[PDB]
């Protein structure tokens, strides 16, 4: 599809079956996800925002599916205000920006 | 153009008559430059992202040409880790999400 940016890029995902609304965020690296508890092995990391860093869980190979795209990789659970799919993922559903 | 992801989408902006790098940020709701000089008065404001907030500058009605293409909006300048274009402008470029 096309998103204008008129409005929050807010799209539903899927991420262990159930269902979450996360914003396309070509201004992320990684994606970022609100709290949790999904169950596997994971690292600990800190990632950097505008305010500075928070601890975060790194899970690898969690598959996400975007409206309706597939896509399968390393998922980062913490204290985020909003859920971030970052290009990490929005590689693999092949989106682009355009103007 | 036509941007994928697979590395930041930086772009080069003209501002107050000097070229700079900044990234294309669609999880933005606002545009945020590292610390510098802008002509003409500004309001103190904070914005928030992960990891928390931050104090900004916000000035009002800045040309900004980024890729050519011109946006005169609010641009907020202070402390943040990089350089973004967020929705505000990107609006007025023109720039979609597609896959
Ligand atoms: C309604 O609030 C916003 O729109 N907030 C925006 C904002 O923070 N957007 C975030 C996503 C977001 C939105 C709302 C609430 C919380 C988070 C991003 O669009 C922009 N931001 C811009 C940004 C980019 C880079 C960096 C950075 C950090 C450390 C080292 C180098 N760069 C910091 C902030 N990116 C990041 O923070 C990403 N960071 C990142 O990719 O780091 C490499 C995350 C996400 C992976 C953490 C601004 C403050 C930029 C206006």
Redesign the pocket.
């Given at each position: 599809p096309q998103i204008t940016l008129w409005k929050r890029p807010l799209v539903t995902i899927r991420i262990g079956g159930q269902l979450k609304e996360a914003?396309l965020?070509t201004?992320?690296?990684?994606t970022?996800l609100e709290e949790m508890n999904l169950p596997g092995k994971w690292k600990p990391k800190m990632?950097?925002?505008?305010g500075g860093?928070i601890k975060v869980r790194q899970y690898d190979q969690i598959p996400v599916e975007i409206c309706g795209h597939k896509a399968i990789g390393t998922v980062?659970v913490g204290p985020?205000?909003?859920n971030?799919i970052?290009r990490n993922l929005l590689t693999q559903i092949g989106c682009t920006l355009n103007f």
């Open positions: 914003l965020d201004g992320a690296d990684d970022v990632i950097g925002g505008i860093f980062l985020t205000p909003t971030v970052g």
